[PDB]
DNA sequence: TTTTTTTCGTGTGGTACTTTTTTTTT
DNA sequence: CTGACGCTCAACATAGGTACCACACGGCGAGCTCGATGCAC
DNA sequence: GTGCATCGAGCTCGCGACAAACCTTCTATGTTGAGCGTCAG
């Protein structure tokens, strides 16, 4: 795991300065090393002279230079992929949800965005040989649609004890975009103490659709949303967790899409399209089945797979 | 219940600022705690320095951090589900209408959207052991179709006093979309003084269909509708009432039958589909019987049940 | 009845502002209070500052807050139900046509939609003890099928004076959908000066069926029809008149359903389905209602208007 | 006393119509 | 050593049929309309 | 005292793109062509 920020006192950093950093949301050496000099300057009691010393010492403990692609290829052979509960999705994702990267699932209502998040909150606790991340799950909810009954249904499927599954899911409810971002600061502190394997934000952009309304507030909305996605990327790099965010859709009311029966695109604009490394486009299928399409990915070919929402969470289409 | 906003002044907030907050529609500590910093700044005489202090004190009285899913599972085991008067619907909903969430019922004319709302306006006054919410009902009407004679019919079925039932229903008629939203501010003030168990908006989207006409006003329509649904969600979280809204349908005039799509869909677009946690799709049966289908839900399997609109409200089909 | 809009300027509104409202179709305080802020802003010369003040002043004169269902139940015990001239129809409607709501009658040709509208245009002038609304009737005709000779036949049945009955019916003929909506603005002005108990639009959707032809004009048709039904609803709330509209039918080729789509089905609080029976008898069926069970009654079109079947 | 610098950000679904065609003696 | 014939899959195309629809910021300044104040017999 | 004239106040409507960029083909049933196994000689 990441090195706790207490290691800086061994490099001559004053314990008072270390405590100032923790109040600023830095709990690991990696978090300090990745932070720009501007962020440390903004912290009261951290002058520019102190900031240079802190960054220099942190860079000693964290490798931040060039390296061969051969070494990097070796590490990526060891990153954990979390099973989605469906063989077809795992074939589509070539293993499952990938840790250390931001994955976005979007689609219209009832398409299963919350159902997949509930499945992942349990499958991430399985041992690695069974397709899990072997760690606790963190669930940040913005819609109020977190249902522990669904988690117990999934835990029944894999033979896990439901009581222990619930204890390993940290749940927080976000009521506004400011609270949604503030929860991440507590998330970083929690992830230092115990090993978390998955972070779920559902829905990531639900609150931005109403806190910032109108074209007048669009620039402030995207700027605030972009800062939120940077913190998610920081947590993914710092702790190696898998970040799964859920997105909504907006209809295109132009006549350009004649060949599409109901054209719609995810909200968030270009800020969230670039930030997400993997985007899954869920849509309604026949009955209880749904279709997942690789909308964006650095390494996955654009393809479709069909899954179903069963009583015991997300699974393959039985019929 | 929620803590009154007067608790803030015990933490050092000026009583004049509290009065300014109440004039802006915040009547409980939860309403202030859930408010983003933007909303408090908009209120005249609330500086940013005041806004930060007000939010800081509110967060001390309201838990807004992470918690175990075990504790959240414990809390949800105590929420109230209000019976719909029909055995089949209660089985379909696994108990009845759930408090603390937005439930949307839609369907074409005559399908029984208003009849269910009339039954719920009475059943919610039953004691909890009989399937009620043991609270008063609030009925916001946007069509003029509120008939107290129907309430008296349902009250006779359950043996309740007709005069007592009518006194425990608060009725307001909304004449436009602006008035419909403004009634929610009065709703929060009323819900602080007396225990309300159910809030009915019927119909939630009837007035939006004509106040904003054409694609030119579509964006302003959905933005206004989205703000209305946020206030409904805020009331559900703040007071724990069940919010039941009613929606209309619009025909699909493309090759929906060619692609096997349904010929009619609810209005409101993606703004109302995402916001509603549970959506019920009522359709006409034979005679007085109707069919209710779970259109969207976080925990309910997509199924159907048959109910009837009897002389004494919504009930089970007698044939 | 409704308070004249001239009461606003006694509350601090400039006289010129009230003039602009009247030219925009607002003639009572209720009409202004019920209007959204958008409608007032669209009036040239009225800014968002004026609109906020006007709406604030109107809300003082018009109650628009929450109230007990007991109080509302008390008011609905005093609404007037206009007799349809038929014992069976009145039993089916539990009193007759209800004021303050939009009632829609549809059916194929010859079913008696216009005959009922002719009977209602007379019975609405009866004293309340005899089942009337004790007010004048307004008849907006879009088909050209208004026949004053039918009114005289109905008036003779109840003993009313034939000349007096015809003087209490305001008749207008609509030649297109734009004109049909525009007549409602003139209707609001007339209803302030005199007590009307019934407004009839026959037929409401007849002109929409041809002014907007094809799927290419369907959205424009339904948007225009929706605004027409909102204006009718505004009149029903503002003046407490019974609004009776008449609708046509279309065959389902997937056996006949009313035209207008979902816009008119949701808007209409009560819908009556009329169909042909033996001889001159007809059958009326409650197709939609918030409080009336779906039942059927049989009436007849006699020489003296709609009445009970003689079978 | 001198001396300007710098773009950012997408959102929003609506809306039903139209009937047609007779056949076969014991 | 081989060909005629039926089964199933893999790929492919059309289905009662029909089609249109627009706005929305951040803001200063002409502009020009009328009330409130001042002026000519 | 009557008719006339002016300034403050109000509310209304512009102002700008470089004239392309868009790529989406749907669900579901039955059809069309081909790959393949059977059986007899
Ligand atoms: N126990 C269950 N068994 C089967 N299906 C279920 C069960 N619980 C929920 N579902 C289905 O899950 C579907 C998707 O619900 P979900 O909460 O995942 O939607 P969503 O994509 O988050 O939508 P929204 O935008 O409204 O939040 C629903 O249509 C419902 O039918
Ligand atoms: N007392 C009663 N007994 C039996 N059926 C009744 C009774 N009152 C009303 N109904 C029936 O209830 C049905 C549904 O009416 P309701 O007001 O619920 O419609 P709705 O879904 O709100 O429609 P709309 O879209 O017009 O608002 C009507 O068709 C009517 O036949
Ligand atoms: N004086 C009368 N005595 C008896 N029956 C009459 C009399 N006048 C008209 N009728 C009957 O009224 C019936 C229905 O006419 P009405 O004008 O009500 O039709 P409608 O429903 O408006 O039809 P449409 O769709 O053509 O407008 C006719 O079939 C006619 O026989
Ligand atoms: Ca969800
Ligand atoms: Ca991307
Ligand atoms: Ca209704
Ligand atoms: Ca939803
Ligand atoms: Ca007629
Ligand atoms: Ca209706």
Residue numbers in the entry:
A (entry chain F), B (entry chain E): 21 to 339
C (entry chain D): 21 to 274, 283 to 339
Task: List passages from the publication reporting this PDB structure.
RAD51 polymerises on the single-stranded (ss) DNA overhangs that form upon long-range resection of DNA ends. The RAD51 nucleoprotein filament invades the donor DNA duplex and searches for sequence homology within a three-stranded synaptic filament intermediate.
Here, we present the cryoEM structure of a displacement loop of human RAD51 that captures the synaptic state when the filament has become tightly bound to the donor DNA. The final single-particle reconstruction based on 102,596 particles comprises a nucleoprotein filament of 9 RAD51 protomers and 26 nucleotides of ssDNA, bound to a dsDNA containing the central bubble region flanked by 15- and 16-bp-long segments of donor DNA. In the D-loop structure, RAD51 maintains the right-handed helical arrangement of protomers observed in pre- and post-synaptic filaments, with the same helical twist and a slightly compressed pitch relative to the pre-synaptic filament. The structure of the D-loop shows that the esDNA is sequestered in a basic channel running parallel to the ssDNA-binding groove of the RAD51 nucleoprotein filament. The majority of contacts comprise charged interactions between four invariant RAD51 residues R303, K304, R306, and K313 and the phosphate groups of the esDNA. The D-loop structure shows that the nucleoprotein filament interacts with the double-stranded arms of the donor DNA via the N-terminal domains of RAD51 protomers A and D. The RAD51-D NTD engages the minor groove of the 5’-arm DNA.
